[PDB]
Amino acid sequence: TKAVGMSNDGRFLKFDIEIGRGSFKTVYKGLDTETTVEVAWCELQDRKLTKSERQRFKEEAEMLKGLQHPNIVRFYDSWESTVKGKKCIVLVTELMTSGTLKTYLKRFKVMKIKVLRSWCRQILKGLQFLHTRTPPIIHRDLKCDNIFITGPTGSVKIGDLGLATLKRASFAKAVIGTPEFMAPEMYEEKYDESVDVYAFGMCMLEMATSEYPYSECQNAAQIYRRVTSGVKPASFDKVAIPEVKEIIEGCIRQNKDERYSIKDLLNHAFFQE
Template sequence: MRKLERENESLRHAIENYRELERRRASGPSAPGTAGGEDAEDGEEDEVEKAVEVSPNGTFLKFNEEIGRGSFKTVYKGLDTTTGVFVRLLSGNRLSKKDRDRFREEADLMKGLTHPNIVRFYDFWEVDKPKRSCIVLVTELMTSGTLRTYLKNFGQKKVSLKIIKLWCRQILRGLQFLHSRNPPIIHRDLKCDNIFISGTTGQVKVGDLGLATLKNRSFAKSVIGTPEFMAPEVYEEHYDEAVDVYAFGMCMLEMVTAEYPYSECTGPAQIYKKVITGIKPSSFEKIEDAQTRELIEWCTRLNNKERPTVKQLLNHEFFAEDCGMRLDVANREETVSSDRSVIELQLRVLDAKKRRDTHKENEAIQFNYVLNKDNPEETAKQMVMSGLLAEENWRPVAKMIVNQIQSLVRAREEKRREQAVPQTQSAPAAGPAPTAPGAAVHASVHASASLPAVSAPVDTSVSTESDAALSEKKEKKIRPRRRKTCERLPRLTVLEVKGSDNGPVVSCLLETNQSQAITFKFDLHEADVTAISYKMVYECNRLQ
């Protein structure tokens, strides 16, 4: 308490000194001869020197204390002079006039987003100088930083499932608030780097909403966010709130495994190929808890129509508050493999205060539920009328029945899909050896026209050396590349070629040397590929 009082006192002094210095500057130089005046003024200037920039209205001070940095932003510590509360200042990269106009329209909307699990957006101001043109965002400052940084503090020790559930509930509540606006607000760039936590209270908030909007509006929606957390439909630029559910599933995967999704991939092109084919990250196999694994798989399904809504997730028993009861499907594996409509359920009352005298701690209430016939609420009320449950417990039991039946139906559908897939992958047909990701695509780029693709040189000379000597030479050529990964050049990959009334339409993915991923499309017959390449280089340099 004393430490907090001292910090508040120092803040008050800093604000008073700053305001006093502003008054002196406005009134002109002070008269000489004042005893100790020069020393006092120097002390005040030293105190104010920490503030390197002031908002146009004089409300916010920006200190030269960098607290975070990303490919799109630099984060500084700031101060609200009206309240004495520290804030977070995000200074973004250069933006076009069109992007600024769009952001101004959304600024008032973001100021009105007030929710316990959404980082508060206070204000913004524009910096328009010859060598520096950007927008500075002022948001709430969370004391413990991002959730990803917080996870790193645990080291090799995994976070308990109880804490993960607590975090996830708060993230889902924040997303539900955004998705329930009219029109719905989609975050588009949800990841653990954009989720913030207060370590002293355990409060979690979803942040960088305005920044995510800026990133996705830049470069005609072609500059996309973080590939590891992007749903497949984002690449097609036709998406809805389901992209946030997909990203939430990847965030949950990172919390459970303490590994960044798709860390086994070497670049955005490899991640893209896995994402659009529905291949999960390798860390997905490390999930130990079956229910957690099922939930993450549900959230990250390839078809966005098969993913749950945020509301469905909040109603799921996994994220529900501990009600002192647990419901399970009896002989679950056998029930999943069968097509029986009569399901045996077992309810265990773990809280002694909710347990009836007729039931012991190790006993379960077993009852049948008929699919497509019985109603969860009516079933729970019948248990109350039979004296098996207290009247205040029928709602939690009804919700648990709904969740168990939905989980069982999903498991049966997944089982049927696995059985329907022909087992041909175990014995692949003979054919050419697999190539490195993007190799075939680069070949098609060179054959199509003069597209500005970067490809590794191909050695077409005929050699008479043995296979062993050739393989040894290849290994020697590859080793230096691994040491020079930081010096890689931009890389262009053709994603697909679709036919249209005007001819073939080519979709491409460009990986810049700053690990940015840019997708774009063009008409093969009518487009000027040279102009496209110059435009891409210009936009990449502008956004860096």
């Protein structure tokens, strides 16, 4: 029942109740004493950010805590924190006990077309909000396991904003767990909004197939070689609905200048109310 952690100002309490873990992260129940609203207390594994790097992140956190949109996970605050020999970055966000799209697909095996349409439209509204900030905010790591639902029949919210800074393409990655990948141009660290369109395409592909794209590869290097040569995931040919397949195809183009804009996707016949 007891508090097992606190922010310096006492606004946020940590409870010894584990919500889940995964990808350098453990998430606990917590409390905003200022509103009595329960929150998620996310503890991040530590790197060694140069204090060039650490200043960029505190700047980014300051930018991101000021944002509010119905399809973006609300972010409240971040700071460094110790227990024993471990230091971490704590991130406080709104609590989403219903979990992610990844978990949804596991539980319900398939996503029905009406749900896919509604939730993809919400993901697009979220991305459009980000891309129209001044200056634009690019997510850079959108995937089904960081898109959260408010309920099994609720709305979706984009999670993990701002965390992609810490994990560039130049950065060496152990071959363990599910292999990651990104839009082709991202590997060279020069890029823009369309990387989120490519990622959206891959999200929609996963929602339509209940498979992780490129499941046929065993490591990240294999996927790079295919993505940078325009070789699609095998799952693409398993998409049953032509209109869904066409949308995915128009998002996951190797050449960024050929990809759909967020505007054209929102205006697409598939997404009309």
